[PDB]
Structure formats: C-alpha cells, structure tokens
Amino acid sequence: MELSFGARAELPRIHPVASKLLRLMQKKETNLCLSADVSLARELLQLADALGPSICMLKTHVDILNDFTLDVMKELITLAKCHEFLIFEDRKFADIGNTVKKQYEGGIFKIASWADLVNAHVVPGSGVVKGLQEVGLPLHRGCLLIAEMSSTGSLATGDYTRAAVRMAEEHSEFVVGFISGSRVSMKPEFLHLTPGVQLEAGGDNLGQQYNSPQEVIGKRGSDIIIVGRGIISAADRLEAAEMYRKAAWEAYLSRLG
Amino acid sequence: MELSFGARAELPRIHPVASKLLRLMQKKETNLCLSADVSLARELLQLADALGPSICMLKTHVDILNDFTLDVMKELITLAKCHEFLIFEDRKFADIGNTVKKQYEGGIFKIASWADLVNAHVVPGSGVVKGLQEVGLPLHRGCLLIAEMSSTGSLATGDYTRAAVRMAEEHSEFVVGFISGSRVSMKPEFLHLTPGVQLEAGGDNLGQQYNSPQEVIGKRGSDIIIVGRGIISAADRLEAAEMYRKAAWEAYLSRLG
Ligand SMILES: O=c1ccn([C@@H]2O[C@H](COP(=O)(O)O)[C@@H](O)[C@H]2O)c(=O)[nH]1
Ligand SMILES: O=c1ccn([C@@H]2O[C@H](COP(=O)(O)O)[C@@H](O)[C@H]2O)c(=O)[nH]1
Numbered sequence: 001m002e003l004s005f006g007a008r009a010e011l012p013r014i015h016p017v018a019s020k021l022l023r024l025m026q027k028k029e030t031n032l033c034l035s036a037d038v039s040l041a042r043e044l045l046q047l048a049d050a051l052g053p054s055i056c057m058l059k060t061h062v063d064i065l066n067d068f069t070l071d072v073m074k075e076l077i078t079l080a081k082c083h084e085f086l087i088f089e090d091r092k093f094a095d096i097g098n099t100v101k102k103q104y105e106g107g108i109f110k111i112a113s114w115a116d117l118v119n120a121h122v123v124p125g126s127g128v129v130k131g132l133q134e135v136g137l138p139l140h141r142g143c144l145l146i147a148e149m150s151s152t153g154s155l156a157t158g159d160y161t162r163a164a165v166r167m168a169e170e171h172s173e174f175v176v177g178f179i180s181g182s183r184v185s186m187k188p189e190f191l192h193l194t195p196g197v198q199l200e201a202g203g204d205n206l207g208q209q210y211n212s213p214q215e216v217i218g219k220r221g222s223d224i225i226i227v228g229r230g231i232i233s234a235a236d237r238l239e240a241a242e243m244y245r246k247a248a249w250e251a252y253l254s255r256l257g
Numbered sequence: 258m259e260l261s262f263g264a265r266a267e268l269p270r271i272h273p274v275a276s277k278l279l280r281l282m283q284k285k286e287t288n289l290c291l292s293a294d295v296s297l298a299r300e301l302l303q304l305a306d307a308l309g310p311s312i313c314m315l316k317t318h319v320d321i322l323n324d325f326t327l328d329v330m331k332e333l334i335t336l337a338k339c340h341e342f343l344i345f346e347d348r349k350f351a352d353i354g355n356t357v358k359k360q361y362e363g364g365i366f367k368i369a370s371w372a373d374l375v376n377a378h379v380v381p382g383s384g385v386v387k388g389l390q391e392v393g394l395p396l397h398r399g400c401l402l403i404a405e406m407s408s409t410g411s412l413a414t415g416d417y418t419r420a421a422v423r424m425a426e427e428h429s430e431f432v433v434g435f436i437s438g439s440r441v442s443m444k445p446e447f448l449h450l451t452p453g454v455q456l457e458a459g460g461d462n463l464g465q466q467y468n469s470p471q472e473v474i475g476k477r478g479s480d481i482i483i484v485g486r487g488i489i490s491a492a493d494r495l496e497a498a499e500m501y502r503k504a505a506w507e508a509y510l511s512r513l514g
Binding site for chain 1: 318380408410
C-alpha cells in the first residue's frame with residue numbers, strides 16, 4: 001500500500017514543510033533536488049531561475065559562495081516562491097546542541113532566516129536536534145537527519161543508521177526525513193533524499209560513488225534524488241535537469257503501480 | 258615510558274604543527290585550549306589578548322561571529338603570534354571530499370588561510386581527510402579527527418572511535434591528533450584534545466556533559482583541555498583561565514612522574 005506523494009502530503013502526522021514539498025512534487029512531477037554547487041551568486045541565481053520549474057528543491061552550500069550576502073538569499077527566495085521549490089542548506093550540523101543553535105540562527109549566514117530545510121549528523125546524540133529545534137520550531141522549519149552517506153568508507157551504516165531513524169521518529173515535530181541511500185524508515189511521513197546520483201556508473205577521485213535514479217528511487221525506495229555535477233558540469237544544465245527529473249519521476253511511478 | 262610534551266615535540270614522525278604546539282605548551286606550562294564561544298569580534302580579540310599567555314590554543318567557531326571579517330582573523334593571528342598559541346577552527350568538516358576542500362579553502366571564511374588546525378568527523382570515510390589535504394598540505398596545516406564526543410547519546414564509540422584512530426594513523430602527514438574524551442591512540446605523535454571540561458560536576462540543558470581537568474588529563478590520559486563556558490561565563494575570565502591551566506598542567510605532570 002504505497003501512497004503517492006500527494007496522498008503522503010495529507011498523512012495525519014505529516015510535518016507542514018514535508019506536506020508543502022510533497023504537494024509541489026506531485027503538482028510539478030518532479031522529485032529532483034538540484035545540488036547547486038557553485039561559487040558565484042550569479043550562477044546560483046541563474047541556475048535557480050532556469051531550472052526552478054524542473055526541481056522540487058535547491059540544495060545550497062552557502063559556505064562555498066565567494067560572494068554570499070543575505071540579499072543573494074532574498075533573491076533566491078523570490079525564485080523559490082515563483083517556481084515553487086524548497087531551499088535546503090546542506091550545512092551538516094554536527095556539534096553539541098548549544099553550539100548548533102547559534103550556528104543555525106546567527107553568524108553571517110543567518111541560515112534559519114532563509115533555509116526551509118537543513119540537515120544534521122546524528123553522531124553527537126539527540127542534543128544536536130534539540131539545539132536546532134529550538135531555533136527551527138519557532139521559525140516553522142524542518143530538518144533532515146543523515147542516516148547514510150554515499151562516499152567510500154562511510155560509517156553511517158548498521159546501528160548508526162538505526163540510531164538516526166530512531167532519533168528522527170522521536171523528533172517528528174521538526175525532523176521531516178533523511179539523507180540516505182535508500183528507504184530507511186517504514187513511516188511514510190518521512191522523506192528520503194539521496195545524493196550520489198548520476199545516470200552513468202562511476203564516482204569521483206575523492207570517494208564519491210554514484211548510483212542511477214532508477215536504482216535509488218526504484219529499487220532502493222528513496223523519494224528524491226540530489227544531483228550536483230551530473231547537472232552542473234553539463235553544457236546545457238536545463239536539458240540535464242530534465243533528464244534527471246524524468247528518470248527519477250518514472251522510477252517513482254513504476255514503484256507506485 | 259611516557260614522554261614530556263617537549264620530548265614528544267622531537268619525535269621522528271611528529272607533524273610540524275604538532276611540534277610547534279608541543280613546544281609552546283612546554284615553554285608556557287599550558288595545556289589549555291580556550292573555546293572562544295562569543296558572537297562579537299571585539300570580545301574574541303580582547304579574550305585572545307588577555308588570555309593568550311595562559312593558553313596553548315584558541316578554538317573558534319567563526320560561523321557564530323556576528324561581525325566576522327578576514328581582517329578580524331588577521332588581528333587574531335597577530336595576537337596568536339605575540340602570545341604564542343595556535344588557532345583551531347572547530348568547523349567539524351563532515352561532507353564528501355570534493356565538498357570539504359571547497360569549504361576549507363573558499364567561501365567568505367577562507368578558513369585555511371588563517372586556521373592552524375581544523376577538525377573533521379570521520380563518518381564520511383577517509384575521503385573527508387583526502388579532500389581537506391589537498392588544501393591543507395600545501396598550506397602547511399594540520400587536522401584533528403573527532404574520535405569521541407562529550408555529549409549525551411554520542412555515537413562516536415566502539416568501532417567508530419577505532420575507525421577514527423586508523424584514519425588518523427593512515428593520514429599522518431596531515432592529521433595531528435584527535436578530539437576525544439581520553440587517550441585513543443597509543444602513538445605519542447598524536448595529540449588528544451578534550452572538550453566537555455569544567456571544574457565542577459554537571460552539564461548543560463542540551464546534552465553537554467562535563468568532566469574535570471584532573472579526570473580527563475590525569476585518569477583518561479588526554480593532552481589538552483578545551484574549555485568554553487567554564488571560562489567565558491565567569492566574571493574574571495583571566496583568573497578562570499589560570500585555574501583551568503593550573504589544573505590541567507598539574508594533572509599532566511602527575512601522570513608523567
Ligand atoms: O552522503 C552524502 C551527503 C551529501 N552529499 C552532497 O551532495 C552533493 C553531491 O554532489 P555530486 O557528487 O552529485 O556533484 C554534494 O553537495 C555533496 O556535498 C553527498 O554527495 N553525499
Ligand atoms: O565533543 C565535543 C566536540 C566539540 N565541543 C565544543 O567544545 C566547546 C565546549 O564548550 P563548553 O561546554 O565548555 O562551553 C564548544 O565550542 C563545543 O562546540 C564539545 O563541547 N564537545
């Protein structure tokens with residue numbers, strides 16, 4: 001009894017951010033998250049505008065932008081609202097609770113002010129989530145927990161992955177899903193987002209490993225693919241995004257029956 | 258056959274950054290790292306100047322400064338050189354190698370340009386270290402691997418800690434030690450730095466747990482204590498730093514015999 005994205009958006013325990021995401025995924029027929037791994041604000045914004053209709057989400061690493069300002073993020077929000085996608089800052093909070101609350105709200109990035117979603121590693125224990133909650137719940141935000149990683153030698157396996165699932169399921173007022181390589185929770189309220197995705201087999205020279213959209217959405221049961229270089233390094237990023245969108249969407253439909 | 262800090266500084270396999278640190282620890286009779294967990298540049302710099310003579314290291318979270326600029330970090334370097342301490346940015350890199358190299362070199366913080374030391378979580382596998390190396394080795398920097406954490410529910414235990422030790426010992430041209438609660442490596446070339454330290458028993462409301470300097474240096478065999486609020490929240494931060502310095506230094510001497 002797998003439910004569609006649109007039906008999952010109505011589940012009793014769904015988080016509002018998850019519901020908004022699932023609705024726009026269904027409406028736009030996209031389960032693609034662009035990993036906008038660029039150093040120039042203009043390139044980030046030009047990609048967001050052109051690829052916005054093709055994506056459910058844009059994932060940032062703002063600490064790599066050479067020309068970050070809060071006004072860049074205001075412009076990104078305008079595009080996210082226009083084209084209907086969520087903004088996910090891939091910050092990987094991974095400190096004690098008291099520290100991560102300050103890293104989320106403050107400093108020069110003010111992440112909580114513009115990011116719909118952030119993520120956290122579970123290695124510190126649940127205080128990492130408690131600390132982020134304290135900022136994120138008043139700001140109506142959501143969080144993803146890193147249950148698995150795509151890179152060679154990842155230690156996010158076995159009991160570590162199980163601990164991430166338990167932590168998410170016990171902080172469901174803020175945690176909306178996972179970064180994972182596969183479905184890790186049996187609860188349909190949670191979102192599974194999978195990086196390490198390309199159409200062709202391979203990897204990079206620093207431990208990244210790729211699997212295809214069909215493999216990770218269809219056979220591994222994930223919801224959303226996160227794609228960086230497979231799009232970003234292509235000449236025509238729009239065409240590349242459409243290839244990935246169609247691959248991930250069909251894989252989802254074919255598992256739904 | 259425990260060696261003094263000064264003798265460890267001469268070990269055949271010692272990393273130059275570790276040697277510099279061990280020498281100044283011995284010279285100044287300090288194994289205290291100040292965790293300068295403040296939001297104002299002026300407070301950071303005033304603490305660095307006043308407490309510089311008492312510390313071997315100043316640990317930053319630059320992403321919490323409200324008024325970060327690269328010129329603040331130039332001023333911090335002047336103080337580090339004057340008073341002889343290393344600068345450790347507690348960034349907790351925790352992404353795939355290709356991403357962390359950009360996060361270390363680039364963006365608005367340009368961490369590698371001013372931080373003697375950074376740290377990394379081992380959860381992504383060794384590509385996290387490979388990626389950071391690529392920036393840090395040309396810049397003559399060092400790295401600490403997070404082998405244990407002080408917070409309640411930490412998953413950095415057992416085989417995870419052992420994996421961190423193996424990863425460090427296989428990347429010894431860049432990795433100089435650990436964030437840990439105790440001695441985790443038997444190789445004296447590696448430094449052990451321990452947060453979660455206060456003179457009194459207790460914790461915080463977000464999962465931090467404290468142990469005393471005597472416990473973590475004397476009984477658990479660590480080298481350096483990392484102290485934030487036990488100093489920062491005190492009225493007289495200089496007196497507080499001296500209390501912690503004397504505690505950690507005596508605990509070291511008494512284990513040395
Ligand atoms: O397990 C993980 C978690 C996160 N990312 C992130 O997802 C993107 C993958 O990019 P690419 O390999 O598709 O270019 C990068 O931003 C990277 O930091 C991974 O690749 N793997
Ligand atoms: O396992 C760890 C790793 C790092 N820190 C860091 O060390 C400092 C501890 O501060 P305090 O509890 O002494 O104020 C903080 O900056 C925190 O982010 C910990 O407390 N525990």
